[PDB]
Design a protein around this ligand. Structure first.
Ligand SMILES: CC(=O)N[C@H]1[C@H](O[C@H]2[C@@H](O)[C@H](O)[C@@H](CO)O[C@@H]2O)O[C@H](CO)[C@@H](O)[C@@H]1O
Ligand SMILES: CC(=O)N[C@H]1[C@H](O[C@H]2[C@@H](O)[C@H](O)[C@@H](CO)O[C@@H]2O)O[C@H](CO)[C@@H](O)[C@@H]1O
Ligand SMILES: [Ca+2]
Ligand SMILES: [Ca+2]
Ligand SMILES: [Mn+2]
Ligand SMILES: [Mn+2]
Lengths: 240, 240
């Protein structure tokens, strides 16, 4: 299970409970979601994701319970370019999820090209930190960097303007309260600059009872590293 | 991960994070470790174990840390016989652990006959609730039902007298404090009767850095049900 929690203050190379997909790997005690060269610089055309191995019991039909969960994490982005891409996302998906074919670039390793905006063809809730929004390729994006809540589509149901700061860690808290059905996101830089975005969603009508949680990141023609530095998660089924 | 916790107030049929070995199965919201017939009556010659799927980081060589862990659980045993057998154990072992050939009966599904008392041939720490002690077959046991702490051998490094009570739940708390290296066990029945036993052990010299935790039970010629009713576990790496 009814409750599960785990904490990664850092990421040592000897991991046993993480599923690595695509180009994701541990380097310097952090997870590098997207590929880097020998010298450690970001490269184009790369997708990577990680999922915790134990499944999370998000809701239980037999008892009408739904989980209250909280995910706290920190990440930093670095790039030689003034317009690094494409972004990183915390996501919740069915357990057998895998990287969809062609999901690189602005699709963030989460959606397939042909169905990226079809809410009926996907099962995913994600919180994206999107740094690239050129309207010729990312047609669904507002025209500025942003944090968005994605419910079955790369076109966010709610966004807030955000500032990308090269090399600075962003601390994020994502919480879901089954009582109010509010998924709240609070992100802050060390100087106190804060961003907040929230959305009401009934997770029961979007995702199965059991899910896996993790992170995804991608770079298409433009690039930057997507470094996940720490991550804590706790979930508890509650009756509301 | 450095920290992991999970809680099973009950065990609904739909499980995803448990590894079932032998005859173990969920019935009536509890784990029946040993086989029961259609009526729910115990049968002879059965062994069953469950393990939590995620691996636990017990200690870390690179940082000299060792985990503080606590395992709380309740179980009940029932048998129409006057000498129900053989017992249930909470155990910690390497991740790839499987039921040893011939480990039924008094070996509790934990040891192989040929090496059951050879401390160099095993890697297991277990807390046993042993109800069968006939000196002619269970030659390593004291002559009364007992709680025992087993370190790489079925011959307990320590035992205390215990009373088997048919159909009554026993609540147990097992804790390990890495600073004192004490493994403490406290068990109570609902009328307040209490049993306590402690042992000092450096888990680093017995077990590998990553392990799995779970329960094992067996019945040989004599039998009884071994029903695990609830279980919560928490582990966190500490500087020591
Ligand atoms: C070379 C490459 O990886 N192309 C992927 C492409 O990337 C697009 C766009 O989506 C990105 O936002 C920008 C900046 O990195 O680069 C390209 O213009 O996205 C496709 C999905 O729409 C992927 O299938 C391609 O792999
Ligand atoms: C029939 C059977 O399962 N025999 C197992 C045997 O069981 C012994 C003893 O260990 C038990 O304590 C008692 C009470 O149940 O029954 C028999 O006397 O134990 C062997 C290991 O010592 C197993 O290999 C046998 O499978
Ligand atoms: Ca984008
Ligand atoms: Ca015995
Ligand atoms: Mn976007
Ligand atoms: Mn014994």
């Amino acid at each position: 299970q009814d409750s599960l929690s785990f904490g990664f203050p850092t990421f040592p190379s000897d991991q046993k409970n993480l599923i690595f997909q695509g180009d994701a790997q541990i380097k310097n005690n952090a997870v590098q979601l997207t590929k880097t060269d020998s010298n450690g610089n970001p490269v184009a055309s790369t997708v990577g994701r990680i999922l915790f191995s134990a499944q999370v019991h998000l809701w239980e039909k037999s008892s009408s319970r739904v989980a209250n969960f909280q995910s706290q994490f920190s990440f930093s982005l670095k790039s030689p370019l003034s317009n690094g891409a494409d972004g990183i996302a915390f996501f919740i998906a069915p357990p057998d999820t895998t990287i969809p074919s062609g999901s690189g670039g602005g699709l963030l390793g989460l959606f397939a090209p042909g169905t990226a905006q079809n809410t009926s063809a996907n099962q995913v809730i994600a919180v994206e930190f999107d740094t690239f929004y050129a309207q010729d390729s990312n047609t669904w994006d507002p025209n500025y960097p942003h944090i968005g809540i994605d419910v079955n589509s790369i076109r966010s149901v709610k966004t807030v303007k955000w500032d990308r700061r090269d090399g600075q860690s962003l601390n994020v808290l994502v919480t879901f309260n089954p009582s109010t059905r509010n998924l709240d996101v609070v992100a802050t830089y060390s100087d106190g600059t804060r961003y907040e975005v929230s959305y009401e969603v009934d997770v029961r009508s979007v995702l199965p009872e059991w899910v896996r949680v993790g992170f995804s990141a991608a770079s298409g023609e433009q690039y930057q590293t997507h470094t996940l530095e720490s991550w804590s998660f706790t979930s508890t089924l509650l009756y509301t």
